[PDB]
Amino acid sequence: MSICTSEEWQGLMQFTLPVRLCKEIELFHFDIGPFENMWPGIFVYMVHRSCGTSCFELEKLCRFIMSVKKNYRRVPYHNWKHAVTVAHCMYAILQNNHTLFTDLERKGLLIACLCHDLDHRGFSNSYLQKFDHPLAALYSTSTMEQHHFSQTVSILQLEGHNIFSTLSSSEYEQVLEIIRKAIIATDLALYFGNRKQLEEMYQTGSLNLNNQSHRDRVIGLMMTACDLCSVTKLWPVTKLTANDIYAEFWAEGDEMKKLGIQPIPMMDRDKKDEVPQGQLGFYNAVAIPCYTTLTQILPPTEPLLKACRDNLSQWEKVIRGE
Template identity: 45%
Template structure:
């Protein structure tokens, strides 16, 4: 909360430097800085799923690698891919979840029928890398490039909690079976997926002062979606997105911790003891939330409702714009659409990029085209940099 925007970018650069990734993979310093700034600029100013959330997720991954000693199980190339995935895992998030995309038949839901937003986040990541001056993988061999992109894609898609539930039992079986060899491709992918989820929800393990503030931001964003569902779909939102049930947030936080966070952190800390602070921090915060939940049951108010009571005013007049796809990528050489001052009343603005609407084949076609484009540039580079170091 105390870092300004420039400081957050410096922190991101520092993580790459301290992991020795800049030196190991010959990433030009100006390209790394430009890429980080471009990634930051392609996060929307939503309340929670924004650039600062991405940075916090990356910082937790960095801490897991260093303090948690997980780097001993990873190649340098995998560490590079995981840090990139963390910073990019919510690119262009609109403040609404996959269920909302499906309910509204949004163009993104038509493009990607499963893990809708996660596929979009990955595609945005690819397009930034494919932008001029932003390819931090430019010195990789073609083989290393394929490997790191596979890590990035798998890691970003694993942040869909639906994917987490599918793979959690598999991970539990490996740990309970005494698995200590994580080098096979299949096991490594499962481990990386669990680590991504652990980082994605890691605000739950932060000191209480931080966790309390983050929880209000998450609730604000969820309640905004609930307001949209009432306005646009005439539906009653689920409890965690219903502003009228805001006093139940402590109880819902306890449920979230018990169902998702504690089981994950417990099995991770059992297998990798250096990660135990995540489990202990979550246990501490669970007690805080439980105490607040008990206050609510006694009829006491637990939270300052000044911000959480107020729906987002522009929702009523931006419903049409929600259906638009923005497959544009903002780099340092162009302005972000939301940075431009538009004096036209919001309700009179025309949808952008309407030519990209509702074409079921577009998602796969776009991804294939972009991947081939980036890969072709890597092949050309590889032919002249055969001696480029490989992480193995």
């Protein structure tokens, strides 16, 4: 387990967000990419707007953010950038649905998005279980997710990192509950059933936000919506994040090929020219239904759906040669 230096986190308190970014950041399609220096600062900003400059000890929060950064590997997609990008989507979702979630959920969810893909190796769940890592020998299903959460718990229990320490012991244990499901929910495998359920519940109108496991479901769906929001950005941003996703996929594939194994088309750099078709497949079978269902449960979230539709037709053009 790994911690941060005093220098780094003290550099975090001085930071103040450049005034031009205040309007732009509220936008769902906002892109954090041109502002690396500022990524940990932006998180702070978003928590500060989300629930005040005193929902957390300032000093104690900066420690955490920077340790979390320390525990993102220098991988091309599942890295510090994806952590924050995801966190920003959740921020915008909470900001647009002001009175739907409890203070506890709000903090809970922003913290879970930041740690969602913690200490990620660049390897899929399939890959680790398939052959035949110690991380898959501990956690059988949702292999990388459990690690992600475990990493999270550990960082919290470090020396004065425990941003949740002031709370009651039942609020503490409970925000951790909220955090856990959320992260686990980022396992794309689990998304399909979950969404299917919510779709049914909404159709019959049995969906109840007073129901605890309905909440958990809705939140899951929100996490998924957040994990995937490269697709919700402006086309030129979506393109480049696309290049980061495949770099990681193909390296995984390259490990399958180093042992004679055909990696499935997604992970196969020999299957480059099939990428646009892949994206369209993915928007249709995954992205669109995610945002469609979510927009339905939470109308204010619509701009995400709009932007997904926009990009999907761009891939079309790409495929059709234009």
